Design an enzyme around this catalytic site. Structure first.
Site, PDB file in Angstrom:
ATOM      1  N   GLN A   1      -3.320  -6.750  -2.489  1.00 12.48           N
ATOM      2  CA  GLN A   1      -2.838  -7.425  -3.685  1.00 12.48           C
ATOM      3  C   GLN A   1      -1.819  -8.500  -3.258  1.00 12.48           C
ATOM      4  OE1 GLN A   1       0.069  -6.008  -6.680  1.00 12.48           O
ATOM      5  NE2 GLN A   1      -1.509  -6.302  -8.222  1.00 12.48           N
TER       6      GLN A   1
ATOM      7  N   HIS B   1      -2.359 -11.232  -7.950  1.00 17.48           N
ATOM      8  CA  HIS B   1      -1.457 -10.574  -8.912  1.00 17.48           C
ATOM      9  C   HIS B   1      -1.104 -11.526 -10.033  1.00 17.48           C
ATOM     10  CE1 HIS B   1       1.268  -8.009 -10.800  1.00 17.48           C
ATOM     11  NE2 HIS B   1       1.908  -7.516  -9.745  1.00 17.48           N
TER      12      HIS B   1
ATOM     13  N   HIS C   1       2.186  -8.675 -14.982  1.00 14.02           N
ATOM     14  CA  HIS C   1       3.498  -8.053 -14.907  1.00 14.02           C
ATOM     15  C   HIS C   1       4.675  -8.999 -14.722  1.00 14.02           C
ATOM     16  CE1 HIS C   1       1.176  -4.249 -13.326  1.00 14.02           C
ATOM     17  NE2 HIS C   1       0.921  -4.539 -14.605  1.00 14.02           N
TER      18      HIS C   1
ATOM     19  N   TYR D   1       5.114 -11.778 -12.918  1.00 14.23           N
ATOM     20  CA  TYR D   1       5.336 -12.517 -11.649  1.00 14.23           C
ATOM     21  C   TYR D   1       4.861 -13.946 -11.833  1.00 14.23           C
ATOM     22  CZ  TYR D   1       6.728  -7.947 -10.283  1.00 14.23           C
ATOM     23  OH  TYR D   1       7.437  -6.764 -10.210  1.00 14.23           O
TER      24      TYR D   1
ATOM     25  N   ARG E   1      -5.773  -9.264 -11.065  1.00 18.56           N
ATOM     26  CA  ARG E   1      -5.167  -8.311 -11.987  1.00 18.56           C
ATOM     27  C   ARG E   1      -4.436  -9.096 -13.076  1.00 18.56           C
ATOM     28  NH1 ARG E   1      -1.265  -2.795 -11.418  1.00 18.56           N
ATOM     29  NH2 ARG E   1      -3.041  -1.596 -12.273  1.00 18.56           N
TER      30      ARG E   1
ATOM     31  N   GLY F   1      -2.087   5.163 -10.413  1.00 15.86           N
ATOM     32  CA  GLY F   1      -0.943   4.787  -9.551  1.00 15.86           C
ATOM     33  C   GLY F   1      -0.148   6.016  -9.145  1.00 15.86           C
ATOM     34  N   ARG F   2       0.721   6.543 -10.016  1.00 13.51           N
ATOM     35  CA  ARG F   2       1.591   7.623  -9.595  1.00 13.51           C
ATOM     36  C   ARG F   2       0.848   8.877  -9.166  1.00 13.51           C
ATOM     37  NH1 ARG F   2       5.241   6.474 -14.794  1.00 13.51           N
ATOM     38  NH2 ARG F   2       3.093   5.956 -15.506  1.00 13.51           N
TER      39      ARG F   2
HETATM   40  C1  LIG Z   1       6.405   2.656  -7.839  1.00  5.38           C
HETATM   41  C2  LIG Z   1       5.452   1.801  -8.610  1.00  5.38           C
HETATM   42  C3  LIG Z   1       5.026   0.575  -7.945  1.00  5.38           C
HETATM   43  C4  LIG Z   1       4.123  -0.387  -8.551  1.00  5.38           C
HETATM   44  N1  LIG Z   1       3.752  -1.464  -7.867  1.00  5.38           N
HETATM   45  C5  LIG Z   1       2.866  -2.333  -8.397  1.00  5.38           C
HETATM   46  C6  LIG Z   1       2.410  -3.523  -7.574  1.00  5.38           C
HETATM   47  O1  LIG Z   1       2.790  -3.775  -6.436  1.00  5.38           O
HETATM   48  N2  LIG Z   1       1.493  -4.261  -8.275  1.00  5.38           N
HETATM   49  C7  LIG Z   1       0.956  -4.063  -9.606  1.00  5.38           C
HETATM   50  O2  LIG Z   1       0.161  -4.844 -10.014  1.00  5.38           O
HETATM   51  N3  LIG Z   1       1.376  -3.020 -10.273  1.00  5.38           N
HETATM   52  C8  LIG Z   1       2.281  -2.143  -9.720  1.00  5.38           C
HETATM   53  N4  LIG Z   1       2.757  -0.956 -10.289  1.00  5.38           N
HETATM   54  C9  LIG Z   1       1.711  -0.632 -11.627  1.00  5.38           C
HETATM   55  C10 LIG Z   1       0.694   0.305 -10.972  1.00  5.38           C
HETATM   56  O3  LIG Z   1      -0.314  -0.468 -10.221  1.00  5.38           O
HETATM   57  C11 LIG Z   1      -0.060   1.085 -12.182  1.00  5.38           C
HETATM   58  O4  LIG Z   1      -0.857  -0.079 -12.866  1.00  5.38           O
HETATM   59  C12 LIG Z   1       0.995   1.826 -13.305  1.00  5.38           C
HETATM   60  O5  LIG Z   1       1.383   2.847 -12.123  1.00  5.38           O
HETATM   61  C13 LIG Z   1      -0.512   2.742 -13.559  1.00  5.38           C
HETATM   62  O6  LIG Z   1      -0.303   3.723 -14.097  1.00  5.38           O
HETATM   63  P1  LIG Z   1      -0.101   5.227 -13.716  1.00  5.38           P
HETATM   64  O7  LIG Z   1       0.865   5.217 -12.615  1.00  5.38           O
HETATM   65  O8  LIG Z   1       0.447   5.899 -14.933  1.00  5.38           O
HETATM   66  O9  LIG Z   1      -1.478   5.617 -13.250  1.00  5.38           O
HETATM   67  C14 LIG Z   1       3.537  -0.040  -9.759  1.00  5.38           C
HETATM   68  C15 LIG Z   1       3.985   1.212 -10.551  1.00  5.38           C
HETATM   69  C16 LIG Z   1       4.937   2.136  -9.824  1.00  5.38           C
HETATM   70  C17 LIG Z   1       5.258   3.318 -10.535  1.00  5.38           C
HETATM   71  C1  LIG Z   2      14.026  -1.266 -13.297  1.00  7.63           C
HETATM   72  C2  LIG Z   2      13.972  -0.969 -11.561  1.00  7.63           C
HETATM   73  O1  LIG Z   2      14.406  -0.106 -11.016  1.00  7.63           O
HETATM   74  C3  LIG Z   2      12.829  -1.942 -10.875  1.00  7.63           C
HETATM   75  C4  LIG Z   2      13.035  -1.981  -9.397  1.00  7.63           C
HETATM   76  C5  LIG Z   2      11.665  -1.980  -8.743  1.00  7.63           C
HETATM   77  C6  LIG Z   2      10.671  -2.398  -9.848  1.00  7.63           C
HETATM   78  C7  LIG Z   2       9.289  -2.076  -9.715  1.00  7.63           C
HETATM   79  C8  LIG Z   2       8.734  -2.905  -8.578  1.00  7.63           C
HETATM   80  C9  LIG Z   2       7.227  -2.793  -8.346  1.00  7.63           C
HETATM   81  C10 LIG Z   2       6.510  -3.234  -9.600  1.00  7.63           C
HETATM   82  C11 LIG Z   2       5.509  -4.113  -9.434  1.00  7.63           C
HETATM   83  C12 LIG Z   2       4.664  -4.353 -10.579  1.00  7.63           C
HETATM   84  O2  LIG Z   2       3.598  -5.145 -10.566  1.00  7.63           O
HETATM   85  C13 LIG Z   2       4.908  -3.724 -11.976  1.00  7.63           C
HETATM   86  C14 LIG Z   2       6.586  -3.480 -12.138  1.00  7.63           C
HETATM   87  C15 LIG Z   2       7.073  -2.623 -10.985  1.00  7.63           C
HETATM   88  C16 LIG Z   2       6.577  -1.140 -11.049  1.00  7.63           C
HETATM   89  C17 LIG Z   2       8.612  -2.765 -11.014  1.00  7.63           C
HETATM   90  C18 LIG Z   2       9.186  -2.267 -12.330  1.00  7.63           C
HETATM   91  C19 LIG Z   2      10.861  -2.343 -12.291  1.00  7.63           C
HETATM   92  C20 LIG Z   2      11.410  -1.548 -11.170  1.00  7.63           C
HETATM   93  C21 LIG Z   2      11.185  -0.045 -10.989  1.00  7.63           C
END
Ligand SMILES: Cc1cc2nc3c(=O)[nH]c(=O)nc-3n(C[C@H](O)[C@H](O)[C@H](O)COP(=O)(O)O)c2cc1C
Ligand SMILES: CC(=O)[C@H]1CC[C@H]2[C@@H]3CCC4=CC(=O)CC[C@]4(C)[C@H]3CC[C@]12C
Length: 364
Positions: free
Chosen positions: A100, A181, A184, A186, A233, A323-324
């Site tokens: 990604q 990406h 979200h 960005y 995405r 994801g989680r």
């Molecule tokens: C720790 C964490 C990191 C994430 N990092 C990204 C990322 O790098 N790119 C992105 O598009 N979404 C990111 N997300 C969104 C996840 O790809 C996923 O779409 C949201 O976790 C999906 O749901 P679920 O975790 O409830 O399955 C992240 C979510 C968490 C919790």
């Molecule tokens: C509010 C805070 O702590 C921030 C710090 C790191 C951030 C995460 C960083 C990774 C990320 C990438 C995404 O594409 C969705 C938002 C998330 C999941 C962010 C949500 C806000 C967080 C959890």
């Protein structure tokens, strides 16, 4: 045994043996200086190689693209060589992995930008959110985002070129696919959303103008590699880290998806909700999306296995990215297939740190 989650799917240039994908997950464990993937990150991905498709953590297309301390890049020789080891590990286990690629734009901080200068965006508006830096001990910490500088018109070709080069780099690094990406909050989403885009040139205003940058990027990367290697995405419905999708979000979404379909790319990954909530998609909207896109559609956002089977069986989506559950369960495919319990999640180690909470979570 869950009727269709464990059936094969052609995803552009590769074939997934199941529809349980690993969503992109920022874990902020790369080496600094250099934003370099680590052997530990390779082990974590290898553990998860039974996924239908692994989508990597968001990865910088350039140094400017950086907005989080500990997020990896795919622009330097050192980064390319490290990623080559990670994709080799996944392939050794018969898996598939997509990288990604992001530019974080205004969700960033000057202290990690080149020269320590302000980050860039479509407009000079603060993101009003928090990013993650590292303190003097290397520990992840929250920090308010820096106010960005509006990209000048003649800087936009450079941004497209960065995405193109990063895709070239991803090919050499052995990824199977790339995921742009465009969600979200960005940079690409910053251009897409009226809330974060007040430009008066051809990159702002109408939906055509707002989607211009992402579509330029999609064309450049399709030309650089191949359309069947490119996924994207989007998060075009709802609000994500303070970025909404405008007052005509549904029409604008369908516009974008139609344009994307014209490029014949491998997949469309719909991120349906922010980690906080979001209104659920209506079946009607899912139908409108489905009829406009002829590649694979991946659904994501707090999905259960049941929801994923419901919607795949309805023929509305082809796969789901978890994801989680993938953080906590390297063999999530096997667990779902057997209806086994899951390991409990440990959110305090999602970001930063080391092996604990990362390569920690046992397989069956
Ligand atoms: C720790 C964490 C990191 C994430 N990092 C990204 C990322 O790098 N790119 C992105 O598009 N979404 C990111 N997300 C969104 C996840 O790809 C996923 O779409 C949201 O976790 C999906 O749901 P679920 O975790 O409830 O399955 C992240 C979510 C968490 C919790
Ligand atoms: C509010 C805070 O702590 C921030 C710090 C790191 C951030 C995460 C960083 C990774 C990320 C990438 C995404 O594409 C969705 C938002 C998330 C999941 C962010 C949500 C806000 C967080 C959890």
């Amino acid at each position: 045994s869950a009727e269709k989650l464990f059936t094969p799917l052609k995803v552009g240039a590769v074939t997934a043996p199941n529809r349980v994908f690993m969503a992109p997950l920022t874990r902020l464990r790369s080496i600094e200086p250099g934003d370099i993937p680590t052997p530990l990150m390779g082990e974590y991905y290898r553990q998860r190689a039974s996924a239908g498709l692994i989508i990597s953590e968001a990865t910088q297309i350039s140094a400017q693209a950086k907005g989080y301390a500990g997020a990896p890049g795919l622009h330097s020789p050192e980064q390319i060589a490290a990623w080559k080891k990670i994709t080799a590990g996944v392939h050794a286990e018969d898996g598939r992995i997509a990288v990604q690629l992001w530019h974080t734009g205004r969700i960033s901080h000057s202290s990690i930008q080149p020269g320590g200068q302000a980050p860039v965006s479509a407009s000079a508006l603060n993101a009003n959110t928090r990013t993650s830096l590292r303190d003097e001990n290397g520990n992840a910490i929250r920090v308010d985002t820096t106010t960005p500088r509006a990209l000048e018109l003649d800087e936009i070709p450079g941004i497209v070129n960065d995405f193109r080069q990063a895709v070239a780099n991803a090919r050499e690094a052995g990824f199977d696919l790339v995921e742009l990406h465009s969600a979200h909050g960005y940079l690409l989403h910053q251009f897409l959303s009226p809330s974060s885009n007040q430009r008066t040139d051809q990159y702002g205003g109408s939906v055509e103008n707002r989607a211009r940058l992402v579509l330029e990027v999609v064309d450049a990367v399709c030309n650089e590699w191949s359309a069947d290697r490119i996924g994207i995405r989007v998060s075009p419905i709802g609000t994500f880290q303070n970025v909404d999708n405008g007052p005509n979000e549904e029409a604008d979404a369908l516009y974008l998806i139609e344009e994307l379909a014209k490029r014949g790319i491998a997949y469309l990954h719909m991120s349906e909700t922010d980690l906080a909530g979001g209104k659920p998609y209506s079946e009607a909207f899912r139908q409108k999306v489905r009829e406009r896109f002829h590649g694979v559609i991946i659904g994501a956002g707090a999905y259960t296995a049941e929801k994923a089977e419901d919607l795949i069986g309805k023929g509305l989506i082809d796969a789901v990215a978890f994801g989680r559950d993938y953080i906590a369960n390297p063999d999530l495919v096997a667990r779902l297939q057997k209806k086994a319990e899951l390991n409990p999640q440990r959110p305090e180690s999602f970001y930063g740190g080391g092996a604990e909470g990362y390569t920690d979570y046992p397989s069956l």
